[PDB]
RNA sequence: AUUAAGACAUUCGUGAGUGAUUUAUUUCCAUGAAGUGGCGU
């Protein structure tokens, strides 16, 4: 609702959208006749630019065991430095939902051409809105390891 | 000399045509770079 103009979305609509974005199918096992460009591709995120400084730094995690009377255990690992630009690459398309089902672009054109076309049952999320949705998710939870203890959180450049 | 003698079941013919080992899956979960002061009464 935040990223797109859709006022109301149903649980089945959310399920269909998720299975179209990630599985590229229907919630079940059925295949939708999709075009070449109607596929969601998640490329590799690369380090883009370390402005003034290196991109790799060293950090410590020092577990203290169940016995506080015993010595700690310094663990040294390699991390990506803060203030480093990460480039996320996606190949996203426009998702067409009609009557809580995912439709192809030509399918949705044919549906639009029909007489009993209910505009209330038609929903569309574009590639830009998909990118905004993914950006919000990434800014919410982050990416990588030890995300619960803070590592891998991102800010807008 | 006898309903007999002669007569290749043979000629031509691609196991070939269409087909993505692909789809779904976070190398992640837990973890304090911490602990302690000592002597000169």
Automatic annotation (TrEMBL):
UniProt entry keywords in alphabetical sequence: Antiviral defense
Biological processes annotated in GO: defense response to virus
Domain CRISPR type III-associated protein: 1-155
Designated name of the protein: RAMP superfamily protein
Organism: Bacteroides fragilis
Upper lineage: Bacteria, Pseudomonadati, Bacteroidota, Bacteroidia, Bacteroidales
Encoding gene, per UniProt annotation: cmr6
């Amino acid at each position: 609702i935040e990223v797109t103009n859709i006022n109301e979305i149903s649980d089945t609509e959310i399920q269909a959208l998720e299975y179209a974005i990630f599985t590229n199918s229907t919630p079940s096992g059925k295949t939708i006749e999709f075009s070449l460009e109607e596929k969601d591709v998640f490329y590799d995120a690369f380090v883009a630019d370390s402005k003034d400084g290196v991109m790799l730094s060293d950090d410590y995690i020092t577990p203290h065991g169940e016995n506080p009377l015993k010595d700690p255990k310094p663990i040294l690992f390699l991390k990506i430095r803060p203030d480093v630009t990460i480039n996320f690459y996606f190949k996203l398309c426009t998702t067409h939902l009609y009557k809580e089902k995912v439709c192809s672009s030509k399918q949705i054109e044919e549906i639009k051409k029909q007489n009993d076309f209910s505009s209330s049952d038609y929903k569309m999320i574009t590639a830009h809105q998909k990118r905004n949705l993914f950006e919000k998710i990434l800014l919410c939870i982050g990416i990588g390891a030890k995300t619960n203890i803070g590592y891998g959180q991102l800010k807008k450049l």
